[PDB]
Amino acid sequence: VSRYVPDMGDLIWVDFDPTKAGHRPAVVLSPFMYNNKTGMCLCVPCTTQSKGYPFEVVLSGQERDGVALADQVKSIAWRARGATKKGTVAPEELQLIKAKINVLIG
Amino acid sequence: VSRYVPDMGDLIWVDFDPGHRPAVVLSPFMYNNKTGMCLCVPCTTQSKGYPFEVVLSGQERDGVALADQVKSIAWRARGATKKGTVAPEELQLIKAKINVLIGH
């Protein structure tokens, strides 16, 4: 058996805290090579409701949407937090998340 | 009295749980001020040769920023204080290494 290792663009389900909620969707930004070597990935958390916040990026589903919070970049231990794969975002969704991060940090 | 609010390039001392550590601020004052959050990368005193290290050179002591370990933190809630400021070239190298990881 080989462990699922997140690649860039994956939408994962990952525990964001042992003390409660114990999971949330996140969009992985870093590439497989890095994620596999380090056991870490850069990702942004997702929520279900959009508030019109400027750094929101809509994750568009067949019947229902989600929202990635592009300013809330997190470096996390995806292996230690039991990341599993929920799906994959569109190329343009990943691109927009990165473009918004770029607006914020030099 | 008014609170210190981090600007881009600031080296801050901030509680990292569960506690305090230095971090380099990457996001602009306006964002940090409006949100109470900032994007930063943690620092350590000892370089280990990790590929995403960026050496920070100071008057007395040195250390490294871990450029891959970008994180969004509640700086105001974690009691951030100012330790100093990184050189433009140091900030640029940190951003360059992030872009290698998370660039288009």
PDB file of C-alpha atoms in Angstrom:
ATOM      1  CA  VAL A   1       0.000   0.000   0.000  1.00  0.00           C
ATOM      2  CA  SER A   2       1.238   3.478  -0.873  1.00  0.00           C
ATOM      3  CA  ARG A   3       0.036   6.637   0.864  1.00  0.00           C
ATOM      4  CA  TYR A   4      -1.828   9.341  -1.030  1.00  0.00           C
ATOM      5  CA  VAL A   5       0.538  12.279  -1.465  1.00  0.00           C
ATOM      6  CA  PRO A   6      -1.005  15.668  -2.330  1.00  0.00           C
ATOM      7  CA  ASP A   7      -0.129  17.340  -5.598  1.00  0.00           C
ATOM      8  CA  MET A   8      -0.532  20.990  -6.567  1.00  0.00           C
ATOM      9  CA  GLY A   9      -4.248  21.756  -7.102  1.00  0.00           C
ATOM     10  CA  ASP A  10      -5.554  18.896  -4.976  1.00  0.00           C
ATOM     11  CA  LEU A  11      -8.423  19.623  -2.668  1.00  0.00           C
ATOM     12  CA  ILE A  12      -7.712  17.724   0.535  1.00  0.00           C
ATOM     13  CA  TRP A  13      -9.563  17.012   3.749  1.00  0.00           C
ATOM     14  CA  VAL A  14      -7.201  17.657   6.640  1.00  0.00           C
ATOM     15  CA  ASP A  15      -7.425  17.931  10.432  1.00  0.00           C
ATOM     16  CA  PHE A  16      -6.866  21.544  11.536  1.00  0.00           C
ATOM     17  CA  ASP A  17      -6.786  20.805  15.293  1.00  0.00           C
ATOM     18  CA  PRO A  18      -6.873  17.856  17.748  1.00  0.00           C
ATOM     19  CA  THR A  19      -8.867  19.890  20.283  1.00  0.00           C
ATOM     20  CA  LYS A  20     -12.348  20.678  18.960  1.00  0.00           C
ATOM     21  CA  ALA A  21     -14.090  21.025  13.458  1.00  0.00           C
ATOM     22  CA  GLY A  22     -11.375  18.372  13.449  1.00  0.00           C
ATOM     23  CA  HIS A  23     -11.227  18.711   9.669  1.00  0.00           C
ATOM     24  CA  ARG A  24     -11.551  21.218   6.838  1.00  0.00           C
ATOM     25  CA  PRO A  25     -11.065  21.287   3.062  1.00  0.00           C
ATOM     26  CA  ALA A  26      -7.844  22.874   1.830  1.00  0.00           C
ATOM     27  CA  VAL A  27      -6.400  23.579  -1.586  1.00  0.00           C
ATOM     28  CA  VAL A  28      -2.802  22.405  -1.947  1.00  0.00           C
ATOM     29  CA  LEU A  29      -0.458  24.958  -3.580  1.00  0.00           C
ATOM     30  CA  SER A  30       2.939  23.228  -3.395  1.00  0.00           C
ATOM     31  CA  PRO A  31       4.145  20.517  -5.864  1.00  0.00           C
ATOM     32  CA  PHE A  32       4.228  16.755  -5.280  1.00  0.00           C
ATOM     33  CA  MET A  33       8.035  16.684  -5.143  1.00  0.00           C
ATOM     34  CA  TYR A  34       8.161  19.059  -2.189  1.00  0.00           C
ATOM     35  CA  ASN A  35       5.118  17.563  -0.458  1.00  0.00           C
ATOM     36  CA  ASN A  36       6.466  14.033  -0.624  1.00  0.00           C
ATOM     37  CA  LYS A  37      10.018  14.899   0.470  1.00  0.00           C
ATOM     38  CA  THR A  38       9.068  17.103   3.431  1.00  0.00           C
ATOM     39  CA  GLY A  39       5.724  15.798   4.647  1.00  0.00           C
ATOM     40  CA  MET A  40       4.637  19.445   4.499  1.00  0.00           C
ATOM     41  CA  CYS A  41       2.536  21.395   2.009  1.00  0.00           C
ATOM     42  CA  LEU A  42       1.468  24.965   1.465  1.00  0.00           C
ATOM     43  CA  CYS A  43      -2.318  25.180   1.264  1.00  0.00           C
ATOM     44  CA  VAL A  44      -5.252  27.529   1.782  1.00  0.00           C
ATOM     45  CA  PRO A  45      -8.362  26.671   3.812  1.00  0.00           C
ATOM     46  CA  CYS A  46     -11.870  26.519   2.351  1.00  0.00           C
ATOM     47  CA  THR A  47     -15.263  27.497   3.680  1.00  0.00           C
ATOM     48  CA  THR A  48     -18.837  26.956   2.483  1.00  0.00           C
ATOM     49  CA  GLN A  49     -20.165  30.519   2.627  1.00  0.00           C
ATOM     50  CA  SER A  50     -18.783  33.521   0.746  1.00  0.00           C
ATOM     51  CA  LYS A  51     -18.832  36.885   2.543  1.00  0.00           C
ATOM     52  CA  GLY A  52     -17.676  38.871  -0.490  1.00  0.00           C
ATOM     53  CA  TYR A  53     -14.209  39.064   1.086  1.00  0.00           C
ATOM     54  CA  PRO A  54     -11.651  40.250  -1.543  1.00  0.00           C
ATOM     55  CA  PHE A  55      -9.364  37.171  -1.192  1.00  0.00           C
ATOM     56  CA  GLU A  56     -12.167  34.653  -1.725  1.00  0.00           C
ATOM     57  CA  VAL A  57     -11.811  32.335  -4.706  1.00  0.00           C
ATOM     58  CA  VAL A  58     -14.964  30.369  -5.629  1.00  0.00           C
ATOM     59  CA  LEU A  59     -14.476  26.624  -6.021  1.00  0.00           C
ATOM     60  CA  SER A  60     -17.183  25.788  -8.511  1.00  0.00           C
ATOM     61  CA  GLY A  61     -18.979  22.461  -8.234  1.00  0.00           C
ATOM     62  CA  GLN A  62     -21.574  20.710 -10.369  1.00  0.00           C
ATOM     63  CA  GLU A  63     -24.424  21.693  -8.055  1.00  0.00           C
ATOM     64  CA  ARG A  64     -22.691  23.494  -5.177  1.00  0.00           C
ATOM     65  CA  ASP A  65     -19.761  25.858  -4.639  1.00  0.00           C
ATOM     66  CA  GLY A  66     -17.082  26.399  -2.025  1.00  0.00           C
ATOM     67  CA  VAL A  67     -14.682  29.231  -1.265  1.00  0.00           C
ATOM     68  CA  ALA A  68     -10.919  29.111  -0.825  1.00  0.00           C
ATOM     69  CA  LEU A  69      -9.446  31.854   1.357  1.00  0.00           C
ATOM     70  CA  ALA A  70      -6.372  32.770  -0.644  1.00  0.00           C
ATOM     71  CA  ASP A  71      -4.814  35.117   1.937  1.00  0.00           C
ATOM     72  CA  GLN A  72      -4.828  32.393   4.600  1.00  0.00           C
ATOM     73  CA  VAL A  73      -1.823  30.415   3.350  1.00  0.00           C
ATOM     74  CA  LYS A  74      -0.791  27.689   5.790  1.00  0.00           C
ATOM     75  CA  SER A  75       2.297  25.462   5.875  1.00  0.00           C
ATOM     76  CA  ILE A  76       1.064  22.198   7.382  1.00  0.00           C
ATOM     77  CA  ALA A  77       2.236  18.696   8.156  1.00  0.00           C
ATOM     78  CA  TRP A  78      -0.285  16.987   5.832  1.00  0.00           C
ATOM     79  CA  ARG A  79       0.898  13.473   6.729  1.00  0.00           C
ATOM     80  CA  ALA A  80       0.748  14.028  10.504  1.00  0.00           C
ATOM     81  CA  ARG A  81      -2.729  15.578  10.055  1.00  0.00           C
ATOM     82  CA  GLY A  82      -4.061  12.652   7.989  1.00  0.00           C
ATOM     83  CA  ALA A  83      -4.757  14.450   4.698  1.00  0.00           C
ATOM     84  CA  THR A  84      -7.018  12.612   2.259  1.00  0.00           C
ATOM     85  CA  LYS A  85      -8.053  13.614  -1.257  1.00  0.00           C
ATOM     86  CA  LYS A  86     -11.495  15.201  -1.811  1.00  0.00           C
ATOM     87  CA  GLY A  87     -10.862  16.170  -5.419  1.00  0.00           C
ATOM     88  CA  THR A  88      -8.977  18.651  -7.558  1.00  0.00           C
ATOM     89  CA  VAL A  89      -9.567  22.344  -8.311  1.00  0.00           C
ATOM     90  CA  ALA A  90      -9.679  23.731 -11.860  1.00  0.00           C
ATOM     91  CA  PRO A  91      -6.429  25.106 -13.307  1.00  0.00           C
ATOM     92  CA  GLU A  92      -8.005  28.590 -13.327  1.00  0.00           C
ATOM     93  CA  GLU A  93      -9.089  28.218  -9.712  1.00  0.00           C
ATOM     94  CA  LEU A  94      -5.546  27.344  -8.647  1.00  0.00           C
ATOM     95  CA  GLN A  95      -4.195  30.176 -10.813  1.00  0.00           C
ATOM     96  CA  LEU A  96      -6.506  32.759  -9.219  1.00  0.00           C
ATOM     97  CA  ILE A  97      -5.547  31.648  -5.700  1.00  0.00           C
ATOM     98  CA  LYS A  98      -1.876  32.103  -6.625  1.00  0.00           C
ATOM     99  CA  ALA A  99      -2.551  35.465  -8.310  1.00  0.00           C
ATOM    100  CA  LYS A 100      -4.258  36.758  -5.161  1.00  0.00           C
ATOM    101  CA  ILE A 101      -1.384  35.577  -2.959  1.00  0.00           C
ATOM    102  CA  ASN A 102       0.949  37.426  -5.325  1.00  0.00           C
ATOM    103  CA  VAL A 103      -1.041  40.637  -4.874  1.00  0.00           C
ATOM    104  CA  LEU A 104      -0.581  40.404  -1.125  1.00  0.00           C
ATOM    105  CA  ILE A 105       3.079  39.410  -0.818  1.00  0.00           C
ATOM    106  CA  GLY A 106       5.435  41.565  -2.902  1.00  0.00           C
TER     107      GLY A 106
ATOM    108  CA  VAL B   1      -0.631  54.809  23.325  1.00  0.00           C
ATOM    109  CA  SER B   2      -0.865  53.076  19.962  1.00  0.00           C
ATOM    110  CA  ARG B   3      -0.013  49.467  19.117  1.00  0.00           C
ATOM    111  CA  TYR B   4       2.906  48.441  16.915  1.00  0.00           C
ATOM    112  CA  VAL B   5       1.515  47.209  13.564  1.00  0.00           C
ATOM    113  CA  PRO B   6       3.850  45.089  11.428  1.00  0.00           C
ATOM    114  CA  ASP B   7       4.848  46.245   7.954  1.00  0.00           C
ATOM    115  CA  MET B   8       6.261  44.182   5.089  1.00  0.00           C
ATOM    116  CA  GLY B   9       9.851  43.198   5.856  1.00  0.00           C
ATOM    117  CA  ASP B  10       9.559  43.567   9.631  1.00  0.00           C
ATOM    118  CA  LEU B  11      11.252  40.987  11.818  1.00  0.00           C
ATOM    119  CA  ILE B  12       8.805  40.287  14.647  1.00  0.00           C
ATOM    120  CA  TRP B  13       8.745  38.254  17.802  1.00  0.00           C
ATOM    121  CA  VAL B  14       5.438  36.477  18.100  1.00  0.00           C
ATOM    122  CA  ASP B  15       3.903  33.693  20.185  1.00  0.00           C
ATOM    123  CA  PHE B  16       3.934  30.468  18.151  1.00  0.00           C
ATOM    124  CA  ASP B  17       2.126  28.278  20.715  1.00  0.00           C
ATOM    125  CA  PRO B  18       1.410  26.053  22.423  1.00  0.00           C
ATOM    126  CA  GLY B  19       6.294  30.262  23.566  1.00  0.00           C
ATOM    127  CA  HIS B  20       7.665  32.835  21.117  1.00  0.00           C
ATOM    128  CA  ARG B  21       9.710  32.888  17.902  1.00  0.00           C
ATOM    129  CA  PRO B  22      10.945  35.347  15.297  1.00  0.00           C
ATOM    130  CA  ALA B  23       9.220  35.711  11.944  1.00  0.00           C
ATOM    131  CA  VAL B  24       9.633  37.824   8.822  1.00  0.00           C
ATOM    132  CA  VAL B  25       6.483  39.711   7.783  1.00  0.00           C
ATOM    133  CA  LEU B  26       5.604  39.398   4.078  1.00  0.00           C
ATOM    134  CA  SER B  27       2.249  41.187   3.800  1.00  0.00           C
ATOM    135  CA  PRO B  28       1.760  45.019   3.693  1.00  0.00           C
ATOM    136  CA  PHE B  29       0.818  47.250   6.644  1.00  0.00           C
ATOM    137  CA  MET B  30      -2.624  47.995   5.160  1.00  0.00           C
ATOM    138  CA  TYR B  31      -3.552  44.315   5.106  1.00  0.00           C
ATOM    139  CA  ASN B  32      -1.993  43.573   8.474  1.00  0.00           C
ATOM    140  CA  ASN B  33      -3.689  46.604  10.014  1.00  0.00           C
ATOM    141  CA  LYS B  34      -7.144  45.940   8.559  1.00  0.00           C
ATOM    142  CA  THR B  35      -7.247  42.199   9.251  1.00  0.00           C
ATOM    143  CA  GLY B  36      -5.146  41.674  12.367  1.00  0.00           C
ATOM    144  CA  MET B  37      -3.472  38.913  10.349  1.00  0.00           C
ATOM    145  CA  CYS B  38      -0.211  38.801   8.442  1.00  0.00           C
ATOM    146  CA  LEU B  39       1.642  36.385   6.202  1.00  0.00           C
ATOM    147  CA  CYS B  40       5.071  35.587   7.646  1.00  0.00           C
ATOM    148  CA  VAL B  41       7.847  32.989   7.596  1.00  0.00           C
ATOM    149  CA  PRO B  42       9.417  31.655  10.820  1.00  0.00           C
ATOM    150  CA  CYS B  43      13.082  32.161  11.658  1.00  0.00           C
ATOM    151  CA  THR B  44      15.680  30.169  13.535  1.00  0.00           C
ATOM    152  CA  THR B  45      19.171  30.930  14.823  1.00  0.00           C
ATOM    153  CA  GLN B  46      20.966  28.041  13.128  1.00  0.00           C
ATOM    154  CA  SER B  47      21.339  27.381   9.414  1.00  0.00           C
ATOM    155  CA  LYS B  48      21.121  23.658   8.653  1.00  0.00           C
ATOM    156  CA  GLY B  49      21.529  23.774   4.882  1.00  0.00           C
ATOM    157  CA  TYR B  50      17.824  23.291   4.163  1.00  0.00           C
ATOM    158  CA  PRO B  51      17.149  24.404   0.569  1.00  0.00           C
ATOM    159  CA  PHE B  52      14.483  26.991   1.498  1.00  0.00           C
ATOM    160  CA  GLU B  53      16.626  28.754   4.112  1.00  0.00           C
ATOM    161  CA  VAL B  54      17.464  32.383   3.548  1.00  0.00           C
ATOM    162  CA  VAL B  55      20.326  33.694   5.678  1.00  0.00           C
ATOM    163  CA  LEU B  56      19.553  36.879   7.567  1.00  0.00           C
ATOM    164  CA  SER B  57      22.704  38.886   8.268  1.00  0.00           C
ATOM    165  CA  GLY B  58      22.720  41.176  11.295  1.00  0.00           C
ATOM    166  CA  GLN B  59      25.126  43.493  13.108  1.00  0.00           C
ATOM    167  CA  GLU B  60      25.841  41.014  15.903  1.00  0.00           C
ATOM    168  CA  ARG B  61      24.042  37.724  15.232  1.00  0.00           C
ATOM    169  CA  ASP B  62      22.745  35.859  12.171  1.00  0.00           C
ATOM    170  CA  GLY B  63      19.925  33.391  11.567  1.00  0.00           C
ATOM    171  CA  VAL B  64      17.760  31.997   8.765  1.00  0.00           C
ATOM    172  CA  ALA B  65      14.220  32.555   7.511  1.00  0.00           C
ATOM    173  CA  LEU B  66      12.450  29.346   6.441  1.00  0.00           C
ATOM    174  CA  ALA B  67      10.917  30.623   3.225  1.00  0.00           C
ATOM    175  CA  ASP B  68       8.800  27.518   2.516  1.00  0.00           C
ATOM    176  CA  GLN B  69       7.064  27.759   5.882  1.00  0.00           C
ATOM    177  CA  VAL B  70       4.732  30.592   4.932  1.00  0.00           C
ATOM    178  CA  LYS B  71       1.921  31.060   7.412  1.00  0.00           C
ATOM    179  CA  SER B  72      -1.027  33.337   8.108  1.00  0.00           C
ATOM    180  CA  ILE B  73      -1.114  34.340  11.773  1.00  0.00           C
ATOM    181  CA  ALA B  74      -3.174  36.547  14.025  1.00  0.00           C
ATOM    182  CA  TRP B  75      -0.249  38.844  14.923  1.00  0.00           C
ATOM    183  CA  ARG B  76      -2.324  41.106  17.138  1.00  0.00           C
ATOM    184  CA  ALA B  77      -3.775  38.198  19.111  1.00  0.00           C
ATOM    185  CA  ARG B  78      -0.338  36.590  19.383  1.00  0.00           C
ATOM    186  CA  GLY B  79       1.192  39.765  20.836  1.00  0.00           C
ATOM    187  CA  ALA B  80       3.675  40.551  18.062  1.00  0.00           C
ATOM    188  CA  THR B  81       6.551  42.917  18.891  1.00  0.00           C
ATOM    189  CA  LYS B  82       9.202  44.374  16.575  1.00  0.00           C
ATOM    190  CA  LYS B  83      12.736  42.910  16.641  1.00  0.00           C
ATOM    191  CA  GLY B  84      13.943  44.794  13.582  1.00  0.00           C
ATOM    192  CA  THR B  85      13.667  44.871   9.798  1.00  0.00           C
ATOM    193  CA  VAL B  86      15.117  42.689   7.039  1.00  0.00           C
ATOM    194  CA  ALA B  87      17.121  44.158   4.169  1.00  0.00           C
ATOM    195  CA  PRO B  88      15.228  44.589   0.867  1.00  0.00           C
ATOM    196  CA  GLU B  89      17.514  41.932  -0.626  1.00  0.00           C
ATOM    197  CA  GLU B  90      16.709  39.489   2.161  1.00  0.00           C
ATOM    198  CA  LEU B  91      12.974  40.014   1.682  1.00  0.00           C
ATOM    199  CA  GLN B  92      13.361  39.589  -2.082  1.00  0.00           C
ATOM    200  CA  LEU B  93      15.221  36.293  -1.720  1.00  0.00           C
ATOM    201  CA  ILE B  94      12.524  34.966   0.629  1.00  0.00           C
ATOM    202  CA  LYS B  95       9.866  35.893  -1.923  1.00  0.00           C
ATOM    203  CA  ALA B  96      11.883  34.410  -4.769  1.00  0.00           C
ATOM    204  CA  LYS B  97      12.065  31.055  -2.962  1.00  0.00           C
ATOM    205  CA  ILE B  98       8.341  31.074  -2.155  1.00  0.00           C
ATOM    206  CA  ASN B  99       7.668  31.750  -5.828  1.00  0.00           C
ATOM    207  CA  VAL B 100       9.768  28.734  -6.784  1.00  0.00           C
ATOM    208  CA  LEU B 101       7.448  26.607  -4.663  1.00  0.00           C
ATOM    209  CA  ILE B 102       4.094  28.278  -5.270  1.00  0.00           C
ATOM    210  CA  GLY B 103       4.631  30.358  -8.418  1.00  0.00           C
ATOM    211  CA  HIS B 104       2.651  29.764 -11.631  1.00  0.00           C
TER     212      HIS B 104
END
